[PDB]
Design a protein around this ligand. Structure first.
Ligand SMILES: O=P(O)(O)[C@@H](CCCc1cccc(Oc2ccccc2)c1)S(=O)(=O)O
Ligand SMILES: [Mg+2]
Length: 324
């Protein structure tokens, strides 16, 4: 139908690099995961728009899931760039309602909980590392949780896929953290902060000081510390994919992880993270594994003894080598 063509039209307008893997999914997953994406995309577009006042935003975010069953609803007052998905929501929420009930449930659930969770972190920055996980859990982990419950609901994946929330969480925590990390300049010049204060704060006195070239030294030290943090998810990742049994689902999951891993390798001990831009076989686990193990070595081979988190980086690479 024509509202569907529009939905995949939006999927491509907005998704930098999922478009292809989503449209390649087998069966009812395709559309389940296309609409799922568009819904969360709408939700985020709201969260990120800083022209929307907090008192106006918290309600939107909270009640957003409910808008899924309000055919006529839409948001016209947005100034963010992906704002078509909101101005023309009714179309999305319509295809949502054509989704099979078993899929609407998962979607509207994760939608409902992301909402109460994004509105949570509007007031405050991300202070500690337990919080960084928490915020990454909300925006990203739940997507990881949610997708895998769609997978199993589709019957294209085992029940054991969607039962495993701890590792589905990890899949997203990892992806999300590498993005937070890479995005440091983009986030800081769009006036946002997601680097964990109790981390960055003991290299510098305010976060923006990393955009200063008189500070790059300490900047990379913070960058590596966080990378090492992010690397700690790579085992759960390897465990999660090792369980998948559908090529379409598998490529959907592997690719972005492998690509998250490349980004993290490109950024390690790398000035350009704070200067400009960072330029950078994955279709069976043991290929995927080999590929992961490879990038790990690159990290390893550039850990300077001086860097105050050398032992940790090596420490967690050594565990990834000899795990599973
Ligand atoms: O929360 P952030 O860091 O701003 C990030 C949006 C993350 C929330 C989100 C939106 C849309 C899709 C999404 O995850 C999916 C969901 C379904 C299919 C593929 C990916 C997660 S964004 O960089 O894309 O804005
Ligand atoms: Mg956001």
């Amino acid at each position: 139908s024509s509202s569907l063509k529009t939905c995949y039209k939006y999927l491509n307008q907005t998704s930098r690099s999922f478009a292809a893997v989503i449209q390649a999914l087998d069966g009812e997953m395709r559309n389940a995961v296309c609409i799922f994406y568009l819904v969360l995309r709408a939700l985020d577009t709201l969260e990120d728009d800083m022209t929307i006042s907090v008192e106006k935003k918290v309600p939107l975010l909270h009640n957003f899931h409910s808008f899924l069953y309000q055919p006529d609803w839409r948001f016209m007052e947005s100034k963010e760039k992906d704002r078509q998905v909101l101005e023309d929501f009714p179309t999305i929420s319509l295809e949502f309602r054509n989704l099979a009930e078993k899929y609407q449930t998962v979607i509207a659930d994760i939608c409902r909980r992301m909402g109460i969770g994004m509105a949570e972190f509007l007031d405050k920055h991300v202070t500690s590392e337990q919080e960084w996980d928490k915020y990454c859990h909300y925006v990203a982990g739940l997507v990881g949780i949610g997708l895998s419950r769609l997978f199993s609901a589709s019957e294209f994946e085992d029940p054991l896929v969607g039962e495993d929330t701890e590792r589905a969480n990890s899949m997203g925590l990892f992806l999300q953290k590498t993005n937070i990390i890479r995005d440091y300049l983009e986030d800081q010049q769009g006036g946002r902060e997601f680097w964990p204060q109790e981390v960055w704060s003991r290299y510098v006195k305010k976060l923006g000081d990393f955009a200063k070239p008189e500070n790059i030294d300490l900047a990379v030290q913070c960058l590596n510390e966080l990378i090492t943090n992010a690397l700690h998810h790579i085992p759960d990742v390897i465990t999660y994919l090792s369980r998948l049994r559908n090529q379409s689902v598998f490529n959907f999951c592997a690719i972005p992880q492998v690509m998250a891993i490349a980004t993290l390798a490109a950024c390690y001990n790398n000035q350009q993270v704070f200067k400009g831009a960072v330029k950078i076989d994955a279709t069976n686990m043991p290929a995927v594994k080999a590929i992961i193990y490879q990038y790990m070595e690159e990290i390893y081979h550039r850990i300077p003894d001086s860097d105050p988190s050398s032992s940790k980086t090596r420490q967690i690479i050594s565990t990834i080598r000899t795990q599973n």
